[PDB]
Amino acid sequence: ESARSLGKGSAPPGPVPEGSIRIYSMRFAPFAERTRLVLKAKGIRHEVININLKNKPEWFFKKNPFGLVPVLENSQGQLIYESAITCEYLDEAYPGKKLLPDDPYEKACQKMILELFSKVPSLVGSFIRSQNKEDYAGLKEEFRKEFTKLEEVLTNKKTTFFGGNSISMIDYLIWPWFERLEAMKLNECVDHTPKLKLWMAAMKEDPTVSALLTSEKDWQGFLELYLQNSPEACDYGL
Amino acid sequence: ESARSLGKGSAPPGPVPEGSIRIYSMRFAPFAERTRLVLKAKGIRHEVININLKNKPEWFFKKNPFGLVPVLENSQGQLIYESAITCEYLDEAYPGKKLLPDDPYEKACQKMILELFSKVPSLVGSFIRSQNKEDYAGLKEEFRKEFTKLEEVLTNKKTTFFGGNSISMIDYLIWPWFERLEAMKLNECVDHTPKLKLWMAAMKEDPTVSALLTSEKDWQGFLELYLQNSPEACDYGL
Ligand SMILES: N[C@@H](CCC(=O)N[C@@H](CSSC[C@H](NC(=O)CC[C@H](N)C(=O)O)C(=O)NCC(=O)O)C(=O)NCC(=O)O)C(=O)O
Ligand SMILES: N[C@@H](CCC(=O)N[C@@H](CSSC[C@H](NC(=O)CC[C@H](N)C(=O)O)C(=O)NCC(=O)O)C(=O)NCC(=O)O)C(=O)O
Ligand SMILES: N[C@@H](CCC(=O)N[C@@H](CSCC(=O)c1ccc([N+](=O)[O-])cc1)C(=O)NCC(=O)O)C(=O)O
Ligand SMILES: N[C@@H](CCC(=O)N[C@@H](CSCC(=O)c1ccc([N+](=O)[O-])cc1)C(=O)NCC(=O)O)C(=O)O
């Protein structure tokens, strides 16, 4: 119940309490899942306000003039948005093991892999609107090209994850789009990419990933409503 | 003469000497100017290899598989690309005053302003191909919308530059597209944005900006050839 989204007409929320940080999110948004994975991995005390993205509160544009999730707001009232920016902010502003490497080159490398990956979210957007078996074959091809590039990174590095043999920031940043791959009927696109397939399996075993994983059933329920343009999609299940 | 670009058929360059870093650049490329402004501002010893982007050396794709400038290569053979990534790398890997703030929020802010600005390079690409007075009026409008957003940042901050009252990373990252504004006949788009106009004037007074500024005459010579699709554009003037 408490997870229900805030939409048009809702009262603006109060101040974030000292000792917590707040994320404005939506339970099915992969960009916000990045930020939540980082919050979870670093053990950062936080609250979540879900936003009805189909019927947004007017006040939400005071949080982010772009009107998008994720957004962080801290107890000092500071606002941070763009998922990758929010993630690096958390890594720097909070204690515990650092998800990004301290080494400048290794850090730059993670950011270059993110750029390599950056076509995938737009492709997923397109697959979700694919109309027939002809479109779907073409989509499968574009994903295959993209996935072969990621395979090459793992091949060159000889490690299970993209930043080393332990999970790190870059893995959490790309994960949410792979999470949805099964549902979108694109789990055959990883057939030519064996290291990437192993990576997926290893990601699903990570405690932070597992804790935040959404079931096939729930994602499908959301997708059905989202594509029906329903103002209740964001609250699928409740 | 030494600044002449390397193109198809050129021998791959040798190793970068210990104590220097190398930038693969092109004298008229605004994305590479970012990196050169940072090299200059931090006093970093470096060499430049200009790339003929119309007729690229095959070996350049071993430096950057995307085939784009800028690219950094250091004496250890490490390769970094994407202009913003190269700039942050230099700020972290070399001594001297830091162009990016140490504070996580203030740093995240610079990155958010960069995202705010990020439509402008694609617009400049479009203006350069604008065909008549009707297209040009429409372009002027899109720039005006974008420039009003940047004006708002300076208004909210009450400082001459985008990261404070002293020049910092964010200013150097956005400067190269404003440098070209005069030439593109878009210097009237800043009429409604007075703080942004003052910013331009202050940028031109910066020693690092001034040292790297290209004259109206030379940019025009390059543009003329670039749009004529000439393999000699990159070496305009020599
Ligand atoms: N560069 C930004 C992008 C952030 C972004 O796009 N956020 C989305 C979160 S939903 S994540 C991205 C996108 N989903 C959406 O755009 C949802 C749109 C909303 N439901 C509406 O009603 O308009 C998507 O492709 N999901 C994959 C899938 O459906 O399987 C958002 O808030 N959109 C609101 C809007 O566009 O107005 C970042 O990295 O943070
Ligand atoms: N995201 C990357 C973008 C880098 C990028 O686009 N680099 C350009 C440098 S030229 S800077 C960007 C672009 N110029 C060009 O694309 C030049 C293309 C080349 N001359 C050719 O022959 O294809 C531009 O719009 N300039 C404004 C102007 O002309 O006034 C490049 O190497 N292009 C090679 C290519 O596309 O194949 C980054 O930030 O580094
Ligand atoms: N619109 C802009 C592009 C916006 C953009 O690309 N942002 C970066 C992320 S913002 C940069 C940053 O500061 C950062 C912080 C942390 C990490 N990291 O943790 O690895 C990496 C980069 C990115 O790689 N976007 C692609 C994506 O987010 O999928 C344009 O048209 O040019
Ligand atoms: N293709 C991608 C977008 C690529 C991208 O947006 N890169 C960042 C820059 S890369 C992030 C980063 O790590 C960084 C490093 C330094 C600074 N800074 O010094 O301020 C900021 C961000 C950016 O803001 N691009 C916009 C631009 O470069 O104009 C996509 O489709 O999503």
Author numbering:
A (entry chain A), B (entry chain A): 4 to 241
Structure paper excerpt:
The inducible phase II enzymes known as glutathione transferases (GSTs; E.C. 2.5.1.18) conjugate endogenous and xenobiotic toxins with electrophilic centers to glutathione (γ-glu-cys-gly, GSH). Like all cystosolic GSTs, the omega-class isozymes have an N-terminal thioredoxin-like domain and a unique helical C-terminal domain. The omega-class isozymes instead have a cysteine residue (C32 in hGSTO1 and O2) in the active site that is oxidized through the formation of an enzyme-GSH mixed disulfide with the concomitant reduction of a co-substrate. Thus the omega class isozymes function as thiol transferases/reductases.
